[PDB]
C-alpha cells in the first residue's frame, strides 16, 4: 500500500469489464502498488527513469530479441502509439537484451517500427525489479500505469494490444 | 477454488508436447485430437496458432498433461497453471476461467533455444459458443 496508489485502484475495478477478449489475460490491480522506478536507456544511451514518465498512463512492455511472442507484437504496440499516444497516454517498450546493443535496433529497424523509440537496459535489472514485486513471471510482461507511477493492471504474455479490445481499455483508463 | 477442496471438473482436456507443439485432446466431447502450431500467412494477426485450446468460461476445466518425447513446461500465468508434462506419466491441474477472450503463454525468463518455442494458445467461450464449438470440432478433427 501507497495511499497515493488508490485511484489507480479505482481506474482498474472501473475498466475491468474491458479486460477481455484479445486481452483478457490482464490482470487488474486490487491492491494499491506503487512500481519500482525503473531505469533504462534511450535510443540516444541517455539514463531514464519511470518517474520521467510521471504525468501520463503508461503501457510499459519489456521485450526482447530472443522472445518470440515478445517480438512478435511489437508491431500492435507500435500501433498503439501510433493511435493513442498524446498529452495522456504513452507507450513505454523497454528492450532487455544482454548481449549485441544492435539486434534489437536492427530488429524495429527492419520491422519498420518508428513510433516506440528505443528504451533499452541492456542489464536487464528493469526485469529483475519487477521480479521482485511479483510482477514478471516471463516473458513479455506488459504493466499498465498511471500517471503516478502506479499500477492499474498486469499482463503476464503478449497480447493484441492494437485490436479493438485494446484501444477501448487503454482510452477507458486514460481519460 | 478452495485450496482445502478437491476440484470437480466440468470438463477434462489432455495436452501432449512434443518437439515443438501442444497437441489437445478432449475425451469428454468426442475423443478427437488436434495440433496447435503457430500460425502463418493470417495477416493482419501477429500471433497465435491455427488450432486453439478451446473452453467454456466459469467451468472448472481439468488439464492433464504429458510429454512425447521429452519434458515439456505447460505454464499460463492468468489461470495460476505451471505443471510438467512428463514422458510416461499424466500430470493434473484444474483450472477456472472468470473472463472470456485469449489466452497467451510465455517464454520463460531463461533465454531459450532454436525453434524450440511452443505457443499455448487458450480460447475462453461462453456456454453455446462451446457446444457450437465442439459439434463443429468433432467433424473437422475427425
Request: no cysteine; glycine share 12%; net charge positive.
Given at each position: 500500500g501507497d495511499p497515493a496508489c488508490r485511484a489507480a485502484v479505482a481506474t482498474a475495478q472501473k475498466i475491468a469489464p474491458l479486460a477481455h477478449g484479445e486481452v483478457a489475460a490482464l490482470t487488474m490491480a486490487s491492491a494499491p502498488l506503487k512500481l519500482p522506478d525503473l531505469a533504462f536507456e534511450d535510443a540516444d544511451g541517455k539514463p531514464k527513469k519511470?518517474?520521467?514518465?510521471?504525468?501520463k498512463t503508461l503501457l510499459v512492455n519489456l521485450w526482447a530479441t530472443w522472445c518470440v511472442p515478445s517480438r512478435k507484437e511489437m508491431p500492435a504496440l507500435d500501433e498503439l502509439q501510433g493511435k493513442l499516444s498524446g498529452p495522456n497516454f504513452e507507450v513505454v517498450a523497454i528492450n532487455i537484451d544482454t548481449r549485441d546493443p544492435e539486434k534489437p535496433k536492427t530488429f524495429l529497424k527492419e520491422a519498420n517500427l518508428?513510433?516506440?523509440g528505443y528504451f533499452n537496459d541492456q542489464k536487464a535489472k528493469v526485469f529483475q525489479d519487477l521480479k521482485a514485486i511479483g510482477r514478471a513471471l516471463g516473458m513479455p510482461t506488459s504493466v499498465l500505469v498511471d500517471p503516478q507511477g502506479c499500477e492499474i493492471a498486469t499482463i503476464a504474455g503478449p497480447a493484441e494490444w492494437a485490436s479493438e479490445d485494446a484501444l477501448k481499455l487503454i482510452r477507458a483508463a486514460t481519460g | 477454488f478452495l485450496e482445502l477442496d478437491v476440484p470437480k471438473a466440468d470438463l477434462t482436456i489432455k495436452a501432449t508436447g512434443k518437439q515443438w507443439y501442444w497437441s489437445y485432446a478432449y475425451p469428454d466431447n468426442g475423443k478427437f485430437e488436434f495440433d496447435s502450431l503457430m500460425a502463418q500467412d493470417k495477416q493482419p494477426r501477429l500471433l497465435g496458432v491455427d488450432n486453439e485450446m478451446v473452453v467454456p468460461v466459469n467451468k472448472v476445466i481439468r488439464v492433464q498433461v504429458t510429454g512425447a518425447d521429452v519434458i515439456h513446461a505447460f505454464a499460463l500465468p492468468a489461470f495460476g497453471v505451471k505443471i510438467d508434462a512428463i514422458p510416461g506419466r499424466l500430470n493434473e491441474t484444474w483450472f477456472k476461467a472468470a473472463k472470456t477472450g485469449m489466452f497467451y503463454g510465455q517464454c520463460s525468463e531463461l533465454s531459450g533455444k532454436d525453434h524450440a518455442f511452443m505457443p499455448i494458445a487458450i480460447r475462453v467461450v461462453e456456454d453455446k459458443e462451446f457446444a457450437s464449438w465442439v459439434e463443429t470440432a468433432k467433424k473437422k478433427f475427425a
Open positions: 519511470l518517474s520521467d514518465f510521471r504525468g518508428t513510433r516506440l | -
